[PDB]
From a paper:
Five total amino acid differences between the 19.3H-L1 and 19.3H-L3 VLs congregated in and around CDR1: 19.3H-L3 contained two threonines (T) and one phenylalanine (F) in CDR1 that were not present in 19.3H-L1, while arginine (R) and glutamic acid (E) residues arose just downstream of CDR1 in the FWR2 region of 19.3H-L1 that were not present in 19.3H-L3. Three CDR1 residues that differed between 19.3H-L1 and 19.3H-L3 (Ser/Thr at residue 27, Gly/Thr at residue 29, and Tyr/Phe at residue 32; Kabat numbering scheme) did not create any substantial structural differences between the two antigen-binding sites. These changes did, however, have the potential to influence antigen-antibody interactions. The Tyr in 19.3H-L1 to Phe in 19.3H-L3 change at residue 32 likely increased the hydrophobicity at the center of the antigen-binding site, which may have augmented hydrophobic interactions with the antigen. The Gly to Thr mutation at residue 29 added a polar side chain with additional hydrogen binding possibilities. Finally, the Ser to Thr substitution at residue 27 provided a more stable side chain. As a group, these VL alterations probably enhanced the antigen-binding affinity of 19.3H-L3, explaining its increased autologous neutralization breadth. 19.3H-L3 also neutralized Envs carrying the I295T substitution (0-B24 I295T and 2-B31) but displayed a much weaker level of neutralization capacity against Envs containing the I295R substitution (0-B24 I295R, 2-A9, and 2-A13). Conversely, 19.3H-L3 strongly competed with both itself and 19.3H-L1.
Numbering used by the authors:
A (entry chain L): 1 to 9, 11 to 27, 27A, 27B, 27C, 28 to 95, 95A, 96 to 106, ...
B (entry chain H): 1 to 52, 52A, 53 to 82, 82A, 82B, 82C, 83 to 100, 100A, ...
């Protein structure tokens, strides 16, 4: 019942080829040849590009093509162009007669250097504490391509309660920014030795820590 | 050209009900099945429901089964989504989507060939409520303002009444488990200016006639 599995992020240079994967089980992708792909540019409706594993509607460039093998479907884009930059979604018909969408993949057409994020971790201000609330703010800035995942550590244990992360959007300087919030009580904040914001970008991880001092 | 026009989305309390419409033209409406698909802002697509071209059986995602009801009125080229027992996690943009294959009784062959621009449904139990603004205190430095617990959208944030624009970034709002919005606005500045230069964020929340100015300082 969870989304079909897709890579978070995939990127290539103009001219290159990339393939996105979509992995299900014998309950959907493995049994049925009714896998479709959709393209969605930011703030726009999705647009169909591939149906029934391999077929292409009229109007869709044939640089796009699809295949399947076992529990994995694949979309392949060749001769990568700037306009191909978008999110890509697969979807599979299931044995329950439902349609199951994958988690999506951000496809970046590389037009600038890879840039690791700068992370600044803000403890709750004193004013917020006076108001009986505590929010840790994790500011993530200057990264390319625009995809990260954020993890919060309390002292040394994982925490995902009261976390809220925005999705990367462009900054004025043309790189990406994102933010994550950890809400908790002043008791929680004062009790632990530390809290940590962990940001993962292109297989790399940068970490910031704050302590009530 | 195929046209799909959704409407009816808006704010509704948890446990409440709301009914979306999709009016369609540019194809023979009665020969195709229709779908509803949803997307929480900046998240992935999630298939909601399908109604076949001619009465038979409607299919639903497990997450909406028993609460949601799809249907159609061919006489007006309209598909409906009746949403009852709304939960906060139902907040999403709802798209209406034509099924590609003619005369099909399952959302099967062909995928979804055309989609509308969508309608936004916000599931919160909250009313007009002004933000509380807290400072995020700072060779470069990051400083900012946390704009907390307001409803509904939007706020707007300037720095120093507009004179400061370089290195500014106002994030998108997050809807919290409380049914309220929070955003941050940030400026990256020269460390060497922290003592001398004054940084004030101006937070405007039109829905409540609230403006807040907050000088943010080191330490």
């Amino acid at each position: 019942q969870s989304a079909l599995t897709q890579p978070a992020s995939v990127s290539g240079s103009p001219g290159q080829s990339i393939t996105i994967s979509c992995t299900g089980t014998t309950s959907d992708v493995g049994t049925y040849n009714f896998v479709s792909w959709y393209q969605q540019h930011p703030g726009k409706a999705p647009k169909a590009i591939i149906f029934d594993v391999t077929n292409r509607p009229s109007g869709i460039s044939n640089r796009f093509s699809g295949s399947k093998f076992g529990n994995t479907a694949s979309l392949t884009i060749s001769g990568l162009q700037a306009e191909d930059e978008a999110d890509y979604y697969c979807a599979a018909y299931t044995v329950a007669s439902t349609l199951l969408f994958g988690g999506g993949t951000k496809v970046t057409v590389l037009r600038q250097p890879k840039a690791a994020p700068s992370v600044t971790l803000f403890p709750p201000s004193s004013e917020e504490l006076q108001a009986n609330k505590a929010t840790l703010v994790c500011l993530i800035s200057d990264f390319y391509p625009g995809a990260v995942t954020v993890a919060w550590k309390a002292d040394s244990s994982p925490v995902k309660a009261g976390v809220e992360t925005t999705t990367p959007s462009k900054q004025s300087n043309n790189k990406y920014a994102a933010s994550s919030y950890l809400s908790l009580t002043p008791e929680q904040w004062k009790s632990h030795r530390s809290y940590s914001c962990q940001v993962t970008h292109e297989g790399s991880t940068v970490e910031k820590t704050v302590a009530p001092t | 050209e195929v046209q799909l026009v959704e409407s009816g989305g808006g704010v509704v309390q948890p446990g409440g009900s709301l009914r979306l419409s999709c009016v369609a033209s540019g194809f023979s409406f009665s020969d195709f099945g229709m779908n509803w698909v949803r997307q929480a802002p900046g998240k992935g697509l999630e298939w909601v429901a399908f109604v076949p071209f001619d009465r038979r059986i409607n299919y639903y995602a497990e997450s909406v089964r028993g609460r949601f009801t799809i249907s159609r009125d061919d006489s007006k080229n309209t598909v409906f989504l009746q949403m009852d027992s709304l939960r906060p996690e139902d907040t999403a943009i709802y798209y209406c989507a034509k099924h590609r294959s003619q005369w099909n009784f399952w959302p099967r062959e062909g995928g979804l060939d055309h989609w509308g621009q969508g309608t936004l449904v916000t599931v919160s139990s909250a009313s007009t409520k002004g933000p509380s603004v807290f400072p995020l205190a700072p060779g470069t430095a990051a400083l900012g303002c946390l704009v907390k617990d307001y409803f509904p959208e939007p706020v707007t944030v300037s720095w120093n009444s507009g004179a400061l624009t370089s290195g500014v970034h106002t994030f998108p709002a997050v809807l919290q488990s409380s049914g309220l919005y929070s955003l941050s606005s940030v400026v990256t500045v020269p460390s060497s200016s922290l003592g001398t230069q004054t940084y004030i964020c101006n937070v405007n929340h039109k829905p409540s006639n609230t403006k807040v100015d907050k000088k943010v300082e080191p330490k």
